[PDB]
Amino acid sequence: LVKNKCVNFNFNGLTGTGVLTESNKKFLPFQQFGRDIADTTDAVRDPQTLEILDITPCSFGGVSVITPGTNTSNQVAVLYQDVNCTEV
Amino acid sequence: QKLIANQFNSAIGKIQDSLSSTASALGKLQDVVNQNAQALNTLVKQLS
């Protein structure tokens, strides 16, 4: 098991791709999946050792090319929207 | 002037409580925000 690094995970038949992290949300013992308002999978419990893992989509955001007119320059500054600067 | 001063100030004060004591004054805004978050929920639930 790996943390804070986007993986493609299967937990006890539950499949999903996200960023598995430590999490403070506390399950009831019999429970399996945490969820969210969208019914989308949110938190999970590691079966081999019980621990509450969050999930998170990959990153996404749109690419945006900031440019002066091609009449001025051919240089552009790329904006990656709504991401943290690592995965670049 | 002095009178109009007080009427103004005492009018401003009640604007606080008009907002402070009732949450329905902002419904117009609150409705906009909800309907946006509304359709998004609906749009998401359509995935399932």
């Binding site: 969210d36 308002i37 969208a38 989308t40 998170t56 989509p57 996404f60 955001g61 749109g62 929207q81 709504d82 | 907002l19 949450a23 004054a25 902002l26 805004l29 609150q30 925000v33 998004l40 749009l43 998401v44 995935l47």
Partner: peptide, 25 residues
């Protein structure tokens, strides 16, 4: 601001930031 108040970002619905921050408004 008290009265008014990745869920949709998981799929694709990305809530872009309004050009003008509230502090500017």
């Amino acid at each position: 601001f008290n009265k008014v108040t990745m869920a949709y970002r998981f799929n694709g619905l990305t809530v872009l930031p309004p050009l003008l921050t509230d502090e500017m408004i």
